[PDB]
Amino acid sequence: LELDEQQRKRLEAFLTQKQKVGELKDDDFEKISELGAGGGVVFKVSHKPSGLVMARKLIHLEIKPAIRNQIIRELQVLHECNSPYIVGFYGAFYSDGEISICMEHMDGGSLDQVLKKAGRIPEQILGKVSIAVIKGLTYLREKHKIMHRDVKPSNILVNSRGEIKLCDFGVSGQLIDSMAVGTRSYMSPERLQGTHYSVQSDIWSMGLSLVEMAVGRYPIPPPDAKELELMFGCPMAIFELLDYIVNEPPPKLPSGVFSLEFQDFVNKCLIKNPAERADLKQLMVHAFIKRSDAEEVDFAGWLCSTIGLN
Ligand SMILES: N#Cc1cccc2[nH]nc(N)c12
Ligand code: NA
């Protein structure tokens, strides 16, 4: 988790900006636009006193003062997360029936939005995405002993400075309890079977997200012979999908389109058995990761061109 000079400096600039904000209050925010929707909506906002642009997630919940004060206390844990791979946090408060979580605004939005625009994401770009997700999960586990629990393309945010960060990792037990409704389509077979689940379940979710972004389609059930010819030239209800995940072989990338190191990387993430599945330590030294790290890929450049950012 050692940072380079440029990363160390952005982290310091963020904290110095954050220290000037003070206590977050409802009437200090001006809504600019909507950034996306879930059990909550995300708005791009202006924090009028500080002049900072933020992402404000509003979770509408009717709960007694007892419950909201415990949720807010639990979200204070988010002030301790300081990493290039974790979306910056400004603060949490309650106001007129809703919890607000104020975060760093990521101008590239989430990877589900980027994928919608791009059609499919190139393998070299997914190499940088994989490095950031692994480093993000390593940071959470090593410095805070917590697991993400909700890795999916909509929880991976990107920006025009080429940064890739994780958001929405559950930190409050009470906030989840008072809710308790996001998709279960990225959950590992072992979590869907209620059995033993560690950071290995986040690795499965990463593997699945990477296949979806590479092929441009949620990868379950697998695409047929004709669906692949449509893609590279070369319906299922949620309950049927979850049964498919638990009972059928895992998805895989099509061969002949992707490098064998990339195919091997996703196969090691998607091994059904969590014990056999690669761990964070092993993924960090996988051939695909070492190769992607040595590649000097202009992620910001690719991103701005693809989504018309600027
Ligand atoms: N979309 C989105 C989103 C969700 C949570 C935090 C955020 N910061 N910047 C965003 N665009 C964003
Ligand atoms: Na979630």
UniProtKB/Swiss-Prot annotation:
Catalytic residues identified in the record: D150
Pfam family, one: Pkinase
Molecular function terms from GO: ATP binding; MAP kinase kinase activity; MAP-kinase scaffold activity; mitogen-activated protein kinase kinase kinase binding; protein kinase activator activity; protein kinase activity; protein serine kinase activity; protein serine/threonine kinase activator activity
Coiled-coil boundaries: none
Expression sites by tissue: Widely expressed, with extremely low levels in brain.
Family per similarity comment: Belongs to the protein kinase superfamily. STE Ser/Thr protein kinase family. MAP kinase kinase subfamily.
Protein role: Dual specificity protein kinase which acts as an essential component of the MAP kinase signal transduction pathway. Binding of extracellular ligands such as growth factors, cytokines and hormones to their cell-surface receptors activates RAS and this initiates RAF1 activation. RAF1 then further activates the dual-specificity protein kinases MAP2K1/MEK1 and MAP2K2/MEK2.
Protein's name according to its UniProt entry: Dual specificity mitogen-activated protein kinase kinase 1
The organism of origin for this protein: Homo sapiens (Human)
